Amino acid sequence: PLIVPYNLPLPGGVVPRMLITILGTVKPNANRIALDFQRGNDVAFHFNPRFNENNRRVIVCNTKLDNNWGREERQSVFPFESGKPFKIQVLVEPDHFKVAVNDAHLLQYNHRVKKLNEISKLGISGDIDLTSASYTMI
Ligand SMILES: OC[C@H]1O[C@@H](O[C@H]2[C@H](O)[C@@H](O)[C@H](O)O[C@@H]2CO)[C@H](O)[C@@H](O)[C@H]1O
């Protein structure tokens, strides 16, 4: 449905209790998915399932400040499956983004970018069909 890369405005930025739900389907032979929670040019939270990083599936999380990626946080747990529908839920908590994929907690990403209200765009890219990207307050 939705065009990828998709930019989901997060009006007024993120706030704890904001739940962002991304439904899509990983393309066959997907290489990557990326969610980029952006604070302007900075990526407050880059959530980057990599389907083939040295023949491993890994989730790389990072923050890009001033065009410099920070310390990657890597999660070996990889709930995405090429070709398959997924649901990513990013719950903004006070101290971290909490990411659940297909209703299973996947990872937390401590806020490195502290101005949550300035994290006002979510870029959704990569090898997905994007069915829906929405947010709500829980
Ligand atoms: O850190 C997220 C960021 O990673 C970049 O790739 C890194 C790669 O993860 C690392 O193993 C290597 O040593 O450096 C690369 C360049 O910084 C991706 O290019 C970028 O898109 C993000 O996913």
Author numbering: 113 to 250
What does the publication say?
Within this work, the possibilities to perform SSX at BioMAX, the first macromolecular crystallography beamline at  MAX IV Laboratory in Lund, Sweden, are described, together with case studies from the SSX user program: an implementation of a high-viscosity extrusion injector to perform room temperature serial crystallography at BioMAX using two solid supports – silicon nitride membranes (Silson, UK) and XtalTool (Jena Bioscience, Germany). Here we have presented an initial integration of two SSX environments at BioMAX in order to collect diffraction data from micrometre-sized crystals of membrane and globular proteins at room temperature. The environments were different fixed-target scanning supports and an HVE-injector for LCP extrusion experiments. Data collection using fixed-target supports was comparatively fast, simple and required only a few microlitres of protein crystal solution, which could be grown directly on the support.
SSX diffraction datasets from galectin-3C crystals were collected using XtalTool supports and silicon nitride membranes with U-turn continuous scanning and an average data collection speed of 100 µm s−1. The crystal size did not exceed 20 µm and the X-ray exposure time per image was 0.05 s for both datasets. The second dataset from galectin-3C crystals was collected using silicon nitride membranes. A volume of 0.4 µl of the sample was distributed directly onto the membrane and covered with a second membrane to create a so-called sandwich. No additional sealing was needed to maintain the humidity of the sample as it can be kept at the beamline for up to 30 min before crystal dehydration at the chip edges can be observed. Two sandwiches were needed to obtain a complete dataset with a total volume of 0.8 µl. The resulting experimental electron density maps were of excellent quality, revealing the presence of lactose (ligand). The root-mean-square deviation (r.m.s.d.) in 120 matched Cα positions between the two structures is 0.47 Å, which is higher than the usual r.m.s.d. (<0.2 Å) between galectin-3C structures determined at 100 K. The core of the structure appears most similar, while shifts of up to 0.77 Å are seen in surface loops. On the whole, the data collected from XtalTool were of slightly higher quality, allowing, for example, the identification of more well ordered water molecules (117 versus 72) at the same resolution.
